[PDB]
Amino acid sequence: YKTADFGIWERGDKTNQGISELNASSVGMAKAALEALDELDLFGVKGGPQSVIHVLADEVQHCQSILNSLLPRASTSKEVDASLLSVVSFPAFAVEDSQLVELTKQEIITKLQGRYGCCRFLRDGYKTPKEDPNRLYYEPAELKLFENIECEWPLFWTYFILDGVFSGNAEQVQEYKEALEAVLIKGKNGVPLLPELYSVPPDRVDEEYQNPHTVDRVPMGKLPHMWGQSLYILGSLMAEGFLAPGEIDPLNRRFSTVPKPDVVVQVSILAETEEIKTILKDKGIYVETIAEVYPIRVQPARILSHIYSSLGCNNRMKLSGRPYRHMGVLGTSKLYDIRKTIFTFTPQFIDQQQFYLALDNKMIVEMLRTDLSYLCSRWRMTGQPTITFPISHSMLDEDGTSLNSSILAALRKMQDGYFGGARVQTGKLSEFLTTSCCTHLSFMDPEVARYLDHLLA
């Protein structure tokens, strides 16, 4: 989601100059895989804790946010790419809002569809007659020569078959099937072969400039195109009732676009010291000290990030595990069981060592508001998120005998049930043990391990 890549068409941006860009298809497929590989035992039913592939939903939701910002655009340099058909419906199912799905789909069929297939993107010029077949890159002025003459791949009409059969909107499956069967070329003993691309004849280029998507196109490029052939055969198998949506998608990615209700956030407001607990008690709030939370142990998000660096570490393969990355609200909203000990990690927005934004109590209230709202909008687990919020001396007043007015108001809002667009069910951390996403960190069981067993002992 934060890395730029050459993308599905191995060319980066529209200029085709080796400039990698954040194309939406890569991020969406990344989200689809990450949502696919979560808590998935990778020997299958004959498996155990050692084969669970662990995916942090923080990166998944960042991917979703970046697609939401991107869609219907595929990249900053491209207003829309047909490769978003690999993201909106299938295989990815990486977009949860159906409105964006249809908006992208009509943008595509309006701007990129022709009568021989869908162009990859505007000003593509991958195999147009107005391109030198030797120079791998494109000059900037050369891009304008590809307008209205881009090559149309029938590959993506098979994609429109796939999304049509997955959705169950038969018209589409009929109209686009008759669209695709008229561009298939027969081969061998008469078998349909789908050309990779239909190219403009060099003499009809001007006519298509004046009237786009009107000329007869010739089959050019790789034939048969086994990506397009595979998608066409999959669609034809389903379309005639030999395959089912469940068979192709056991994980049920086809239910990403269905509505999902918001969740009730559990919050365990904690007190660093007994005197902090007494000050908050005088204000009519019921909180438990971080010492009374024992045997449940509370740690900052940096400790969770260090712990999560020990996944997939295999010395002979010379893999050091996950790189040190910040844990968002979701990673810190789940109760982790490590070495049979329940562990609740505080959200990173209260960390004052990394930055001073957590030294400002109004900023504390503001980013708690933002995190709670976003996590309510983006929780996709089993159970209920649980944020442990410890009250420190920095969250008191300058006098030291009173909690800050902003934090007092915020805590009262969470106790009453509403704060910042979120429904908060406050309570003790012990009560939320059975009503949360209890993820067992199986990778640690026989650096950070020494720190952990020091805390446990």
Partner: protein
């Protein structure tokens, strides 16, 4: 790479780098909360955001630029957030519009479709030059109206003027050119100098106010650009507004290049 780029752009100015990353975070959850605060602003210039921050914290609680930065780097993070919200949404705590054009041409804010409207006008011309820096229609055929590279080219032509306010005056002149081109059937077929359009608008403003009784003291030129400070403080619309004088000079300039003109559809 991001941290190294920020530090290198700081050029040893640690304070501007740390304020830069903090303002990046603020811009980030402002995107996540209120995307509409950035519809007019396509390039997010955190350094110029800090500079405008200091300028606005100087205009209120009147003090020097050094004292402005000293105060700026002193407030609480929530104060950074609310002040940035003020500068972005347009909330207000030389003159009113002179502080509304110094805050509009320094962040390089242009109305929605400005980069999409320059494209249409350039097809009726040969180029758009600001301070002798042309933006020809070859760019329009090169890059689409909605292309980000087109916005980059237009702002590169529009950022050739160092000061903020006369840049927004140039933007207003460009847009009155757009509207007059919509009215005008014919095309100029040549280069139009937006800077000289604003200069002729300033001359017309001077003449009209001098006839109506304005003294030389009020009719005072800006030291660098040469546009009168009152014209900077003048309201955009109105009988004597900036966008009426720019609509007055976007016609007398087209006079020499276009000997005969036909205006239709009102």
């Amino acid at each position: 790479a991001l941290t190294q780029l920020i530090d290198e752009a700081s050029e040893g100015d640690m304070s501007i780098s740390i304020l830069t990353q903090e303002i990046m975070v603020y811009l980030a959850m402002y995107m996540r909360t209120q995307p509409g605060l950035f519809a007019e602003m396509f390039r997010l210039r955190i350094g110029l955001i800090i500079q405008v921050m200091a300028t606005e914290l100087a205009h209120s609680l009147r003090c020097s630029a050094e004292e402005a930065t000293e105060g700026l780097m002193n407030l609480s993070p929530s104060a950074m957030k609310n002040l940035l919200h003020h500068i972005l949404s347009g909330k207000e705590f030389q003159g009113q519009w002179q502080r509304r054009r110094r805050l509009d041409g320094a962040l390089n804010r242009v109305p929605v479709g400005f980069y999409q409207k320059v494209w249409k006008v350039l097809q009726k011309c040969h180029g758009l030059s600001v301070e002798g820096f042309v933006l020809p229609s070859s760019t329009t055929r090169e890059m689409t109206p909605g292309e980000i590279k087109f916005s980059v080219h237009v702002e590169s032509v529009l950022n050739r003027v160092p000061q903020p306010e006369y840049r927004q005056l140039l933007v207003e002149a460009i847009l009155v050119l757009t509207m007059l081109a919509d009215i005008e059937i014919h095309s100029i077929g040549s280069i139009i100098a937006v800077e000289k359009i604003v200069h002729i608008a300033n001359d017309l403003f001077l003449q009209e106010q001098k006839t109506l009784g304005a003294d030389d003291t009020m009719l005072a030129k800006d030291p660098a650009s040469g546009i009168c400070t009152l014209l900077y403080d003048s309201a955009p619309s109105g009988r004597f507004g900036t966008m009426t004088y720019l609509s007055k000079a976007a016609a007398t300039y087209v006079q020499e290049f276009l000997p005969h003109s036909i205006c239709a559809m009102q």
